[PDB]
Design a protein around this nucleic acid. Structure first.
Ligand code: MG
Ligand code: MG
Ligand code: MG
Ligand code: MG
Ligand code: MG
Ligand code: MG
Ligand code: MG
Lengths: 140, 55, 155, 94, 107, 41, 67, 97, 166
RNA sequence: CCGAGCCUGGUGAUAGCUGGUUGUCCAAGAUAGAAUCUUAGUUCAACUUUAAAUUUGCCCACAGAACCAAAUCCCCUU
């Protein structure tokens, strides 16, 4: 019976230390544990994607809340900030909505003004002056 | 059965076989076994060349 | 728990020099050693001999300078704060909790020669202000005020 | 109450699907892109006779480079330095 | 896995870098063997790189202990009472230098 | 030769620092692990 | 700040504002697990990574009169 | 729990025994002794395994042919069965034909 | 097998400083290899967990279980050794800190079934452990009040933080 | 457990059939067909893999492929 395995313990414990916080026989029985530690890790890998998506959705929801607080709608806010050429992302928009309410009100006012300027240009349809905040800074 | 600067041997073989090929001959130099390999059959020319060099 | 001095890898002089250099301060070595020597250690070693200079001057100088310098910083930053508020802020900054926290994370406990381990908070506070006093004697009021700013306003 | 026989999206009886406005708009957008593609392919610069041989040199040379690599495949060199370097695995202080 | 491991918040040791930066590495202990083939890279690091590292980091005390051992090791003591023995067993001198620099840059 | 000078410089040859010529010892393939187990080819 | 804020389009002029920061730590992340599994096909891979990281302390934000 | 709870007794080995200190001696007797002897006859072991490698089936056939006569009855029967089985396996089973 | 209880009885403490609490006495006792099921003995021990010595003795004396009689004997001899050897002052000044049952060394016997079938019977044995602590029984934990419930709810509401932001 | 008792041996019987086949990591990798007591298999071919040698390989311009639709074959340029 030469060449037997002598560190099977250490292999079992390598799996069990990650199995330790589960519920039921799968916290100590190697067969049951290893069939679930694999399923845990595979989720730790997909949950990265899901975490990114959920954080973005949370930002959008908070931004919509603040925008509706100022009487504006989220598409209007985002689109008109882009048109005004401020490239703050949704994360910092939510951060400003929560922690910097006056700055967020200023941003909402700017977006509302840009929307009104867009409406004015659309109705005019001619060659009236473009609008103060509708001006585009060009780079070369 | 090469002793000494087998890299010198490689240079000599390259610049002697280049006119006969156009391109530089593809070679492998082994220093452990003091040997030099050339891709292609050049046994007669190399034997005559080494005779004329004196070996 | 046992003191780092009793733990195996240790060299007191090297530790002192590294303390000074990592704090970026040109301490004087004898002054730093006397600022780490306390009276409890002196009495305990005298008893052990039965079977030199303490902290007091350096500690008092460092304490007085810390009071004065923190008071000046605080009343120049907040000129509308009254004497009671300024004194309470100064006492909080030179208080036991803050000073022992800072000394422990600056590895003053490891170099502290005392009688008991862990070092009593009063002993730690006294040794910390003795280090301040040694720095004041070594580098000058401006540099040691920079030190005080850096390690107490940050608190 | 309402079940589709067999599988929904295969077979003789299928669950009906209907065209949405945004799907129609998506198809129309792609239609416009490819109509512009039709135009920009509809104006050619040269003719076949004018282009008959304008790249032969470059194409030939590229193939020669490919051939040169595929023929230069060969084993690498071997070194006294490496073989005697393996002796350091017992390089002790003293 | 997060749920099966601890967690903490981003922090510094003592508001580090507000007034000045203080290097948080305090002591490096090198256990190295004179005759062990596992300690070849450590021996070469002690030969060529340890002195320049010591000069570049006057705030770190480096103890080097040459004793018979099968696994050379490094103990990293930081200002906040940390400790990091890392195995330098069968590592090249560049790898050991990289590890030591990473320890110096760690908090 | 230069090789023998390198030997003079280098540590002593013993039974502890011997190596096969690279390429002479093709590794054995045995049916264990994910890639080579299961149906074992 | 309180009572006013300045908006770049999209970036504010460097003559107008400075951010001063300090590199204070260079570290590694905690080990991250990448496990892939496909069932009934014997598909299973595990990898452990440690992304490098840099801790920066924002020291100062300064503005200058330039509007 | 299949692991010892205590360290095993030390395994001291004397690297400088007679046998170790003189291992390898006279293995060049052929080329240093005018080829009067051979390492193959330096080998000591079973009479059917001196200077001959073989696989298992070849070893079994060789042993039966050389010492099959003065062999115990049950061992000889086992050897015959072994040879029969090995013949079948090597000549009819495997992946490569 | 393991028999650590009987040495827990033999731990010795250093002398006590004249200004610290009296360190109530601890006495360990156990009966090994009792012909009785560990589950049922557990029921009896959980019954007498945390009682006074006399209260446990009364309840056991009027319970209807072989285990009850055995545990009563063990408690009586534990009280005897307590105030005979561990310097307990008053034989009533003791309460049951711990009371558990452990599996013992059993035996296998065949159980002839029908056809040609058989079953393996177990001659079940069990252990009983008990720890007696000097002092009156600790007061039972009072039930939670609505004041406590409201306080905890308010602590949670005030411990809320804004998640996933600065 | 007699459509032919039981035990030992030949016997590790044989099984194109079912079941199983144990460390880590990377890479290439998907099925025209023909015979066959053969269609639950196998041999050749096809496809796939590796290592070597060499030079053209895919897409295709026009012109060119029979009398009694979509397309394809061929094919220089590119
Ligand atoms: Mg997205
Ligand atoms: Mg259905
Ligand atoms: Mg499997
Ligand atoms: Mg079979
Ligand atoms: Mg692939
Ligand atoms: Mg057939
Ligand atoms: Mg078949």
């Amino acid at each position: 019976l030469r060449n037997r395995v002598t560190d099977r313990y250490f292999r079992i414990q390598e799996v069990l230390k990650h199995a330790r916080h589960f519920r039921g026989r799968k916290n100590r029985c190697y067969r049951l544990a290893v069939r679930t530690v694999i399923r845990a890790f595979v989720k730790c890998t997909k949950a990265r994607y899901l975490k990114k998506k959920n954080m973005r959705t949370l930002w959008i929801n908070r931004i919509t809340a603040a925008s509706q607080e100022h009487g504006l709608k989220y598409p209007a806010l985002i689109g008109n900030l882009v048109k005004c050429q401020v490239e703050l992302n949704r994360k910092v928009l939510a951060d400003l909505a929560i922690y910097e309410p006056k700055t967020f009100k200023s941003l909402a006012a700017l977006a509302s003004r840009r929307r009104h300027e867009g409406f004015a240009a659309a109705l005019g349809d001619g060659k009236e002056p473009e609008g103060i905040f509708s001006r585009v800074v060009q780079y070369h | 059965k090469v002793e000494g600067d087998i890299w010198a041997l490689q240079k000599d073989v390259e610049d002697f076989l280049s006119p006969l090929l156009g391109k530089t001959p593809v070679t492998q130099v082994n220093e452990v076994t003091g040997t030099l390999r050339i891709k292609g059959y050049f046994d007669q020319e190399l034997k005559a060349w080494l005779l004329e060099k004196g070996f | 728990p046992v003191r780092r001095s009793e733990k195996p890898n240790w060299d007191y002089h090297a530790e002192i020099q590294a303390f000074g250099h990592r704090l970026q301060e040109n301490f004087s070595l004898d002054l730093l050693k006397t600022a780490f020597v306390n009276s409890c250690y002196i009495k305990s070693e005298e008893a052990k001999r039965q079977q030199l200079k303490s902290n007091q001057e350096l500690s008092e100088q460092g304490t007085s300078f810390s009071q004065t310098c923190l008071t000046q910083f605080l009343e120049d930053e907040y000129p509308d704060m009254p004497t009671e508020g300024i004194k309470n802020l100064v006492d909080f900054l030179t208080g036991e909790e803050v000073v022992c926290h800072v000394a422990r994370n600056l590895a003053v406990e490891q170099l502290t020669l005392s009688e008991e381990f862990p070092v009593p908070p009063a002993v730690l506070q006294q040794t910390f202000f003795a280090v301040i006093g040694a720095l004041l004697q070594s580098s000058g009021p401006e540099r040691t005020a920079l030190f005080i700013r850096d390690f107490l306003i940050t608190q | 109450r309402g079940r589709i026989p067999g599988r929904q999206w295969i077979g003789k009886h299928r669950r009906p699907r209907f065209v949405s406005l945004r799907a129609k708009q998506n198809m129309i957008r792609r239609l416009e892109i490819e109509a512009e593609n039709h135009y920009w392919l509809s104006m050619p610069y040269m003719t076949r006779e004018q282009e008959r041989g304008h790249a032969a040199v470059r194409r030939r040379e590229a193939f020669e480079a490919i051939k040169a690599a595929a023929t230069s495949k060969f084993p690498p060199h071997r070194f006294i330095a490496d073989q005697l370097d393996h002796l350091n695995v017992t390089k002790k202080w003293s | 896995t997060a749920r099966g491991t601890p967690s903490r918040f981003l922090a510094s040791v003592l508001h580090n870098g507000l007034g000045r930066y203080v290097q948080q590495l305090q002591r490096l202990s090198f256990s190295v063997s004179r005759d062990g083939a596992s300690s070849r890279g450590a021996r070469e690091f002690v030969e060529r790189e340890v002195i320049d590292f010591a000069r570049r980091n006057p705030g770190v005390v480096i103890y080097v202990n040459s004793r018979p051992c099968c696994v050379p090791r490094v103990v990293a003591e930081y200002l906040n009472g940390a400790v990091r023995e890392e195995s330098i067993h069968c590592k090249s001198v560049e790898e050991i230098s990289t590890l030591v620099q990473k320890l110096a840059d760690q908090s | 030769a230069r090789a023998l000078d390198l030997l003079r410089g280098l540590p002593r040859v013993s039974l502890a620092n011997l190596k096969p010529n690279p390429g002479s010892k093709k590794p054995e393939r045995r049916p264990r692990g994910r890639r080579r187990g299961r149906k074992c080819g | 700040a309180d009572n006013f804020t300045l908006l770049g389009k999209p970036l504010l002029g460097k003559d107008l504002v400075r951010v001063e920061a300090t590199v204070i730590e260079k570290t590694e992340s905690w080990p991250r697990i990448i496990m892939r599994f496909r069932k009934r096909k014997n598909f299973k891979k595990k990898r452990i990574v440690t992304t490098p990281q840099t801790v920066l302390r924002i020291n100062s934000i300064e503005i200058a009169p330039c509007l | 729990i299949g692991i010892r709870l205590t360290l095993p007794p030390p395994k001291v080995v004397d690297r400088w025994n007679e046998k170790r200190a003189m291992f390898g001696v006279y293995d060049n007797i052929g080329i240093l002794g005018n080829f009067e002897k051979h390492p193959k006859e330096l080998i000591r072991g079973p009479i059917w395994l001196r200077g001959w490698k073989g696989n298992e089936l070849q070893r079994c056939i060789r042993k039966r042919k050389m010492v099959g006569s003065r062999m115990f009855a049950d061992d000889l029967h086992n050897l015959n069965k072994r040879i029969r089985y090995l013949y079948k396996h090597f000549n009819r089973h495997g992946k490569f034909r | 097998i393991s028999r650590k209880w009987e040495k827990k009885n033999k731990i010795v403490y250093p002398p006590q400083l004249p200004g610290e609490p009296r360190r109530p006495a601890e006495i360990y006792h156990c009966r090994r290899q009792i012909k009785y099921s560990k589950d049922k003995m557990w029921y009896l021990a959980k019954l007498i967990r945390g009682m006074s010595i006399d209260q446990a003795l009364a309840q056991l004396e009027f319970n209807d279980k072989k285990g009850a009689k055995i545990i009563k004997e063990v408690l009586l001899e534990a009280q005897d050794m307590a105030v005979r050897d561990h310097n307990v002052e008053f034989r009533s000044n003791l309460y049951i800190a711990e009371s558990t049952s452990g599996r013992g060394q059993c035996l296998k016997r065949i159980r002839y079934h029908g056809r040609g079938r058989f079953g393996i019977m177990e001659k079940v044995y069990c252990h009983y452990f008990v720890k007696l602590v000097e002092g009156p029984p600790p007061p039972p934990e009072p039930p939670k009040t609505a004041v406590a419930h409201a306080k905890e709810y308010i602590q949670q509401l005030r411990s809320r933080t804004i998640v996933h932001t600065l």
